[PDB]
């Protein structure tokens, strides 16, 4: 029963927790509650082998900058997340998350995850973004960012529709074995 420690990081509100809850319970959270720290598990079959997947949820709020890293020791794989409809969270992948993860775990595999895929083509969100002088992050951008931080994989998904969701965790597992 091979165990794997997967830590999920990224700006606050990018959808990290919904990512974990939707994946482990196939249910989507009904109330947004900022995370301090949490843990979820899941036994999964990957390439014909049972794996005990430990999912470590972290705080996106910057008030936890010194405390957050306390969950990093012995991490097998990191999921750096950013919202596909939040250029700010995308920029922080390079300005904050990548450097923070590499500082504490220089050799640990990283998987870049673009979240809220369902909203990229959503009309309401776009108008809202246009009013904010913004626009969604495109796949080519995501892929390019992944190359820049040396991510083993770039993956987009939606916790809401679950499209691309399971793939994220299968790859996270395969990045370790």
């Amino acid at each position: 029963m091979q165990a794997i420690k997967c830590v999920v990081v990224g700006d606050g509100a990018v959808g990290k927790t919904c990512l974990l809850i939707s994946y482990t319970t196939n249910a989507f959270p009904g109330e947004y509650i900022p995370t301090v720290f949490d843990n979820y598990s899941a036994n999964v079959m990957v390439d014909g082998k049972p794996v005990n997947l430990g999912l470590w949820d972290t705080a996106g709020q910057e008030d936890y900058d010194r405390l957050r890293p306390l969950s990093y020791p012995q991490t097998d794989v990191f999921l750096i997340c950013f919202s596909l409809v939040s250029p700010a969270s995308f920029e922080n992948v390079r300005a904050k998350w990548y450097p923070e993860v590499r500082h504490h775990c220089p050799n640990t595999p990283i998987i870049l995850v673009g979240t809220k895929l369902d909203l990229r083509d959503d009309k309401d969100t776009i108008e809202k973004l246009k009013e904010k002088k913004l626009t969604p992050i495109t796949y080519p951008q995501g892929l390019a960012m992944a190359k820049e931080i040396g991510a083993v994989k770039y993956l987009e998904c939606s916790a809401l529709t679950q499209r691309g969701l399971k793939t994220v965790f299968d790859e996270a597992i395969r990045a370790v074995l």
């Binding site: 029963m1 301090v36 720290f37 843990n39 430990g54 470590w56 010194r66 405390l67 306390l70 969950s71």
Partner: protein
């Protein structure tokens, strides 16, 4: 004592130094029944701490502070106006006053530590937490077994072997008898181990044939009625205890282990003594050379000792004060002319101010042995007391009680929450190697103190120490605010020459007894003799849990562990006991022969015969059964002043557990005597089955 929901719900903290330099996120909780304080790491791994093992809780500035720079940074401690002090929590645990473990937690939220510290301590210090019935302790075992699961969410069979280590064979056979997997590397589904399956498992592992004999005398509701009125004296029970209007032997076992059948008159554990009598009319829990953690000549001194003794209700502590060297000129506390380490006088004051009234609201006496031959440092001493103790310090006599001849001392109530300083206010001088040479064996450094200057003198009122001259001299002066201190040797000598006057002296004034200088090993002297004479401050070395301290902790647990016990009215005004040691359960973690000793501590005219059980029939320690005749203590004159000692030892004399119980607090009948450690803390596994009978 009910466990508040938020405690069981849990709170997020960062536990540090559980390793070194390692800070670990955890969710801290107290199970619904108040048995354990346990934290869960992100990896799901759990760590348990018995509520009964906790000695204190601290938050804010009183919490332990991290030293390593790494942790200092993690917690932003070197940051201007941070809020670290609003997040610190420290839980102190340990088998005694010295062997301590500090569990340090830092919360994410602000101000939650205070609630946790106060609520957890209230559970710990609740009299009924330590004095629950046998069934409660057996239940703590079950809760533990079912709470400590593996990754598969099951109970490892290995955990049963660790819980009941004396004989694996018998444990294996017990699991099998309950159709459960017997096998180093099996796990049991928790739903397969509920009550009464656990109960059946216990009955199989620990058969109770002696209880079957009680039946020889099922059991109808009528018989049970006869039993309770004849044996346990001076239908709902059957429904509650019978596993399946008849009571089976197993049902009898659980009933006898239940709360309705307590060996103690539990109301006695609560603060119920009349606290309005004069101070010298009470026995006062006292500590000698409090600052020492070991050894009188070699060993370390620690301000923490003050916290520990005070948290147990000690009301009289000692501070040996010595001058500090320049450039600081800071007074210190140590055992002069030895190799014991030093602590600053100031830290002792800070330790005392913190813990003084956490577990008892009644007055404390600070016995100063002053060797500070420096008016400036003595002024520093007085200053530290006034400023740190603040309003707690009694700086002047009470209006209703002037320091005049014929006036009695105030009562514990009149001095509630007050700290009294015992210091000189007569020969004085500095000690010499030679001067301590011929005192070392008796009075020690206490044999000579320096003169008290103005600053310190002003702080003394109701506890003025003067060298003893004679009982008639004392009676002549008629001053109730003067205290006389004697070594165990001097006090014993006085009892052999003037017992009548010593007894009368204690009705008017205070006498403090302390160990002879020859006890460099910090051993203690038996206190009974002195309490019998009315001596109120019988100071012992709290760091040494030998018999005298075993009895001291036991008797002062009563009256709400306030540290005060009202003397019998015959000591203030100006029955036959039989115990049969029947059997014992899980007495040792290993299979060894065991024996029990029973004796009485009381007045000179009380029964003095001592009893020792025959060795247990074999190395079976799970359920040994003895064949002893009743151990009798005839004509106990004053039950109030006497206590019964029941101690369990394994062959070879290693202490396993005991109970020392004042006679008036004992209930009669068949009982499951839950055993305590030397420091009087409740033990989970060991217990004795006994039969008590009181007659006039």
């Amino acid at each position: 004592p009910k466990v508040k929901a938020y405690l069981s719900q849990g709170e997020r903290f960062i536990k540090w130094d559980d390793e070194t330099t390692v800070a670990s996120p955890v969710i801290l909780r107290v199970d619904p029944k108040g048995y354990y304080l346990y934290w869960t790491y992100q990896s799901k791994e759990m760590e348990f701490l018995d509520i009964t093992s906790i000695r204190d809780t601290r938050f804010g500035k009183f919490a332990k502070m991290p030293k390593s720079q790494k942790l200092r940074d993690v917690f932003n401690m070197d940051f201007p106006d941070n809020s670290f002090l609003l997040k610190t929590l420290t839980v102190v645990s340990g088998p005694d006053m010295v062997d301590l473990t500090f569990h340090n937690f830092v919360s994410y939220k602000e101000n939650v530590g205070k609630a946790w510290a106060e609520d957890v301590l209230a559970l710990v210090k609740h009299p009924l937490t330590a004095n629950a019935s046998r069934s409660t302790f057996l239940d703590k075992i079950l809760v533990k077994l079912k709470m400590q699961l593996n990754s598969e969410g099951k109970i490892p069979v290995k955990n049963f072997f660790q819980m009941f280590p004396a004989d694996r064979k018998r444990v294996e056979a017990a699991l099998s008898a309950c159709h459960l997997p017997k096998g180093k590397n099996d796990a049991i589904n928790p739903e397969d181990f509920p009550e009464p399956v656990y109960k059946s498992f216990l009955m199989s592992l620990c058969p109770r044939p002696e209880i079957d004999e009680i039946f020889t005398s099922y059991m109808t509701k009528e018989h049970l009625t006869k039993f309770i009125n004849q044996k346990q004296r001076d239908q709902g029970l059957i429904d509650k205890y019978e596993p399946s209007g008849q009571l089976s032997p197993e049902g009898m076992v659980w009933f006898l282990c239940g709360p309705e059948n307590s060996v103690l008159a539990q109301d006695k554990l609560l603060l119920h003594h009349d606290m309005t009598q004069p101070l010298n009319h009470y026995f006062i829990n006292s500590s000698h050379n409090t600052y020492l953690t070991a050894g009188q000549f070699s060993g370390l001194s620690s301000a923490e000792m003050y916290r520990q003794v005070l948290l147990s209700g000690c009301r009289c502590v000692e501070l040996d004060c010595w001058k500090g060297k320049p450039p600081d000129e800071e007074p210190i506390i140590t055992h002069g002319f030895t190799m014991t380490t030093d602590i600053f006088f100031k830290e002792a004051i800070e330790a005392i101010a913190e813990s003084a009234f956490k577990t008892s609201p009644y007055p404390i006496i600070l016995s100063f042995e002053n060797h500070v031959d420096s008016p400036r440092q003595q002024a520093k001493m007085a200053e530290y007391c006034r400023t740190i103790f603040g309003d707690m310090l009694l700086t002047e006599p009470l209006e209703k009680f002037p320091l005049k001849p014929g006036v009695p001392l105030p009562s514990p109530e009149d001095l509630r929450g007050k700290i009294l300083i015992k210091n000189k206010k007569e020969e004085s001088g500095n000690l010499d190697e030679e001067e301590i040479k011929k005192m070392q064996s008796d009075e020690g450094t206490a044999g000579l103190e320096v003169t008290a200057y103005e600053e310190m003198s002003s702080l003394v009122n109701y506890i003025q120490p003067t060298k003893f001259v004679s009982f008639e001299f004392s009676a002549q002066k008629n001053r109730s605010y003067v205290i006389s201190s004697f070594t165990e040797l001097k006090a014993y000598d006085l009892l052999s020459k003037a017992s009548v006057q010593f007894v009368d002296y204690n009705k008017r004034q205070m006498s403090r007894i302390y160990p002879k200088g020859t006890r460099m090993d910090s051993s203690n002297y038996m206190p009974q003799m002195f309490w019998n004479a009315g001596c109120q401050m019988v100071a012992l070395n709290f760091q040494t849990m030998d018999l005298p301290m075993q009895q001291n902790m036991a008797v002062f647990e009563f009256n709400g562990q306030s540290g005060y016990l009202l003397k019998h009215e015959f000591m203030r005004r100006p029955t036959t006991l039989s115990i049969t040691v029947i059997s014992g359960q899980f007495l040792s973690e290993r299979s060894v022969r065991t024996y029990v000793e029973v004796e009485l501590f009381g007045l000179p005219g009380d029964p003095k015969r001592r009893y020792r059980t025959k060795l247990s029939p074999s190395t079976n320690s799970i359920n040994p059964v003895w064949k002893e005749e009743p151990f009798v203590f005839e004509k106990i004159l004053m039950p109030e002043l006497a206590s019964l000692r029941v101690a369990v030892m394994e062959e070879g004399n290693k202490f396993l557990g005991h109970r020392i119980i004042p006679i008036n607090a004992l209930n009669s009948g068949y009982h499951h005597l839950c055993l305590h450690s030397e420091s009087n803390m409740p033990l989970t596994m060991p217990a004795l089955f006994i039969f008590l009978e009181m007659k006039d």
